[PDB]
Design a protein around this ligand. Structure first.
Ligand SMILES: [Mg+2]
Ligand SMILES: [Mg+2]
Ligand code: NA
Ligand code: NA
Lengths: 223, 224
């Protein structure tokens, strides 16, 4: 049985470092779990102005916000109220790499609100690279491949940051999702994503985010 | 000019998390920079008993402790007293991966003491893997390849953890060393290493570490 409802909020706190630069970011928002859409506002409270592209952080700021077809098992909506946590490695093509974790829980006061505890760490970003030089434009939409591995769920996705001077900067995501309780495991499937920074101030101390995501079973064999 | 001396101590604090498990470790020791040997004692002050193999942390607990021949430029001994920092990605063959940073400075009192500020983070280690199951024996000795890249120094090394059930568990290190001041840059070279946990209690809350390292320019082209 799922305790998820049509309108739910989320509050989060991210603590991290990129190339040794520490920072803390908090955020709050709301989303529609069954429609796979969500929005939130982020605030850099420590470490601002960030010397790296804010885009490397956006996919860290919850797969519960995915419209899952009735025929596909929803690993995430089943996990609450206890929740789940996830770990992820984000390997960029120029050697830069980031690791992140998010422990997601649900308030039991009936406020239909998620709480995220996030850690983000990145190293080896070249000084003249698009991340440290903040030359990224956005993440392109993507299709994450979901598959079970040793009782837990893995999600792999080929990501790409569109660059200001044109062209793309690739990053490979390897995420492991871990439900805090026993839930039904899904068969191999996909989750299409489209994340966007809808608004931000000059130094990205204030950022508005939006994401639309929908799960599916791939292209039908019949045209 | 180098301010490095024969006998120097080091104090450190490591804060980190592995698969979401937080921990804090402090340590203190002493070493001989010119001889490339050092020893230290570590204490887990938070997060114990660690649920993962302590070995994944040992190479994070200073390339100043390397015997450098006179012919090879020593990027590290040149950097002090200001010091240097390093960043590293440690990619294991089963998908597990750790990132670490170490900011190294020298005491402000002439006590010949280094101070390390360390952050360690690892994720994606399989529950049944040698790290989470603590089936590692030790790191095998290694040879790190040092090369300059965009004004800073890179060090890449093929590492391997000997496992209890025999066989090895490979990890590829990618380190970037950044001097806090302008120093002379070295030509491509190598640093041989041999790190070992010389003593530890049952749950590794207390650990004694030793490392011997020496730089060189590779095998001579002429045999004999
Ligand atoms: Mg922008
Ligand atoms: Mg042992
Ligand atoms: Na399914
Ligand atoms: Na040299």
């Amino acid at each position: 049985v799922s305790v998820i409802t049509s309108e739910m909020k989320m509050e989060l706190r991210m603590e991290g470092a990129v190339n040794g630069h520490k920072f803390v970011i908090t955020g709050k928002g709301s989303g529609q779990p069954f429609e796979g859409i969500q929005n939130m506002d982020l605030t850099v409270i420590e470490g601002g102005p960030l010397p790296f592209a804010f885009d490397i952080l956006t996919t860290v700021f919850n797969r519960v916000f995915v419209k899952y077809p009735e025929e596909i098992v929803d690993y995430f909506k089943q996990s609450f109220p206890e929740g789940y946590s996830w770990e992820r490695s984000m390997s960029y093509e120029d050697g830069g790499i980031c690791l992140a974790t998010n422990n997601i829980t649900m308030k039991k006061d009936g406020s239909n609100c998620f709480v995220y505890e996030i850690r983000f760490d990145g190293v080896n970003f070249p000084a003249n690279g698009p991340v440290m030089q903040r030359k990224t434009v956005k993440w392109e939409p993507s299709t994450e491949k979901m598959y079970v591995r040793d009782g837990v769920l893995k999600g792999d996705v080929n990501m790409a940051l569109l660059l200001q001077g044109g062209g793309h900067y690739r990053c490979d995501f390897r995420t492991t999702y871990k439900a805090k309780k026993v839930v039904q495991l899904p068969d191999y499937h996909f989750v299409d994503h489209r994340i966007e920074i809808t608004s931000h101030d000059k130094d990205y101390n204030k950022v508005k985010l939006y994401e639309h995501a929908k799960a599916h079973s791939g292209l039908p064999r019949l045209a």
